[PDB]
Design a protein around this ligand. Sequence first.
Ligand SMILES: [K+]
Ligand SMILES: [Mg+2]
Ligand SMILES: [Mg+2]
Ligand SMILES: [Mg+2]
Ligand SMILES: [Mg+2]
Ligand SMILES: [Mg+2]
Ligand SMILES: [Mg+2]
Ligand SMILES: [Mg+2]
Ligand SMILES: [Mg+2]
Ligand SMILES: [Mg+2]
Lengths: 175, 118, 73, 59, 47, 133
Amino acid sequence: NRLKDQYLKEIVPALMSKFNYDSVMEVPKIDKIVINTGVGDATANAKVLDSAVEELALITGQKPVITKAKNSIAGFRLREGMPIGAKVTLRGERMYDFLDKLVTVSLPRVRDFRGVSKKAFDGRGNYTLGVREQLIFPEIDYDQVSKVRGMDVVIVTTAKSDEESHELLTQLGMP
Amino acid sequence: ITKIDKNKVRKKRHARVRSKISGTESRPRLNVFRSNKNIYAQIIDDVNGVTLASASNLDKDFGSAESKVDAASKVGELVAKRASEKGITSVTFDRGGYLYHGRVKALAEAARENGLEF
Amino acid sequence: SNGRDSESKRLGAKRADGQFVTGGSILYRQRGTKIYPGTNVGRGGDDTLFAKTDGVVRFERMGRDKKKVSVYP
Amino acid sequence: MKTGIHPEYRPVVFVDTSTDFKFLSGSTKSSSETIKWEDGNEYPLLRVEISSDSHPFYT
Amino acid sequence: RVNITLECTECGDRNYITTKNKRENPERIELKKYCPRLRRVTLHRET
Amino acid sequence: LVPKRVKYRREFRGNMRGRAKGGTEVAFGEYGLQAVEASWITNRQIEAARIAMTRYMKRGGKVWIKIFPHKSYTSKPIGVRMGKGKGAPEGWVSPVKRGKIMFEIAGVPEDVAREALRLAAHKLPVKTKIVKR
RNA sequence: GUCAUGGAGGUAGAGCACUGUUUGGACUAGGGGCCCUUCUCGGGUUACCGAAUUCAGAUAAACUCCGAAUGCCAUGUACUU
RNA sequence: CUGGGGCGGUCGCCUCCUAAAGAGUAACGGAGGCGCCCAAAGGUUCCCUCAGAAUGGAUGGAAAUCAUUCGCAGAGUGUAAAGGCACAAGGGAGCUUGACUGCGAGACUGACAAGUCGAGCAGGGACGAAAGUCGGGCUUAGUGAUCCGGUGGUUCCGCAUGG
RNA sequence: CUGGUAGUUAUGGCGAGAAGGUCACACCCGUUCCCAUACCGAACACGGUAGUUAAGCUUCUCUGCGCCAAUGGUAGUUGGGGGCUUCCCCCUGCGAGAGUAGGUCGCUGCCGGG
Ligand SMILES: [K+]
Ligand SMILES: [Mg+2]
Ligand SMILES: [Mg+2]
Ligand SMILES: [Mg+2]
Ligand SMILES: [Mg+2]
Ligand SMILES: [Mg+2]
Ligand SMILES: [Mg+2]
Ligand SMILES: [Mg+2]
Ligand SMILES: [Mg+2]
Ligand SMILES: [Mg+2]
């Protein structure tokens, strides 16, 4: 709401002026942030997943959905079904809240950061923020929780080109 | 990312409904088209491909509603009436691909309350 | 190691286009829908097409690729 | 939004000790501590490690 | 997997044979079936 | 020349009626050896014909084999009666229908091309015509 | 029996849209030869191999985007028998 | 049975090719399956779309789980193959037991014995707002007669009569 | 003119380009209520109309891909004949597939508003 306000106030005009869009409808907006855990160890011990769900619920403030495997793979020792990884899709005000916390509180708790990596865009307009550890997120309390697991954070933009998306993510605050 | 065309996927569902349901000169199809603003009804013959008694929200006759559901009940009331004037009773309800729930339900419930059998 | 085969199942058309059939007459024996149930025709459990009423059989083009059989009184 | 499924979404203020900035953002783990900013609309408080304004790379 | 017979609780006769996997369904199966004697649906239970 | 694998190990002999449906005109070469009558060409015959072409050209110009031995053929040993199922795969043949260009050559002068192709023709069980594009 | 009309059916032929088999060229991700600090991770090298990609060209009882002649089923108020 | 017999192999059922564009069609001809399974993998209502590749991303590798794009089906369909199937016959979820009782015009197949399909009628139901669909499963294997025994039921008979 | 709903083997599809909008139709704004998500008001559902034609939709243009498609010839082939016969030839009737000239950016209803 703090960030979505800033977006509607003094990002849309500035960004529409920068690219010279015909209508305000063309202006890139953030549709959904999708966090993904990817607990492949769960195949052995299911209890490790229960924690990986609970820890993630606190980060998003929105219980995740336990993703089940697609095809059987002997290499990883995996078989059709069986719970592996947890998804959670953030939209609306509660999404901007997370994005704000991500750029304002979260990211500076990593040893360092280069910034908005040009390589880390899919070439369609969407960004994927590689998160090393779970202890970066202030709601987690790593002193209580066992394994670090990790995390995958996808920002799906309405942008057509990385250039447009890059400017949007930048002015929203992302390094 | 691409926005889903709500009417495209709606029309896809409508096909699934029309698979079972088709109008006859004896028992025509009461088809319902719903917009963001207003709602529209047509009692159709598929064998002839001709629209008998029809009614909409924007029609000059009955143009007073509080909610869209209430508006949609007035349409059911009027399309039922216009059907009875034409001399037809037994219809089959074509959801149009809409969930038989809010407005489209309130159209049927209304029409069914008047002289239309389904 | 070979030398096996199942009994032939006598599939195919059992009534001709333009032939008058009594209700219940089997029109086509088939695996799946080579030919679809038209008007006044039913599809049995094994995909057998039968006339639901008395009339004249008509094999018709459905749309481009598919095909149907109807019975018009 | 389903009820009795997710944890609380209740608002909370984040403040870094060094820079001493304040902003509202809904989150879990309140801790129940009063705030100075917008005391009328009272929310919990959370003490935080250096933010972007403080962190040298960012500013 | 085995052949089963469902006995009518009211009628007292078993005019329904079925099959089940007794490893997956070790309990006695209960189905609501039409009893021709009573001319109505009745709870039928495996013997 | 042998197929790396086959769907079926045993195959009907087939027939050789009509003019070849394809490969009647020379495509890649200057000069081609055209089958005048139908026959089976074995892989052993294709190799004998190939080596007798290439040697005379002395690793000069290119040689396209336009037929491939796709079809297996079986045989019963001596002292074996009829029946007891089809025999074991023995070899590989290409049914060459009349009008099919079997070999093409390019990158040598006419005189050398025409000589290399007659040398090859003498290793094949089929009447041949030398044809140029 | 013929004529006319309608129809089911995938053979001959053909074709390569699919599945197998397959030739040549171009392209190109790998791998392997050959030295280098090197963990041969990556270069500078390549017709020793090689999976895609495309251009051209073949091939099939158990391939088919196609598809006859005939034969088959039927209808007629048609002509003969 | 048998390109003499023996030895070996085979014997019933399903799918394909042989099979010559209806059906049928032989060989100790060419290939594979079956002697089950499923309480949902059945019924119905509602909703949905697959394989793979590219690109980006923690543990994470060629390949796990996210995200976007392209994708008529290159997937799937309990299981062989063929014919079907993307209004899905494929995939979810809710409620259920029609995997009903009496039947059945009329057809297919067929030496017989058997086998197959079936609208519709009655009884009483499941799902659905209704239309409607439902007498198992995308379809086609998964079976074995008679005689004799066993078990349950029964407004049948009961060797003078009641049993 | 536009919204709805049908028929018709894509000549109707795909792709590319352009224009249009309070009259619809859209996106769009919101989640109090009915009702929703195996998490998400994304969708579904409900209540709105500040903003916008950007997209869908509508109309127009094009033959790049697809689709449709003659005539002629050829393959094959019923019947009748011949040969030297792994097969081939002649007469009569039928006659592809490929390729090609060409065609196509649809056509035909019914209902509501304008
Ligand atoms: K010779
Ligand atoms: Mg047979
Ligand atoms: Mg069945
Ligand atoms: Mg052929
Ligand atoms: Mg063929
Ligand atoms: Mg002998
Ligand atoms: Mg013998
Ligand atoms: Mg046949
Ligand atoms: Mg006895
Ligand atoms: Mg007595």
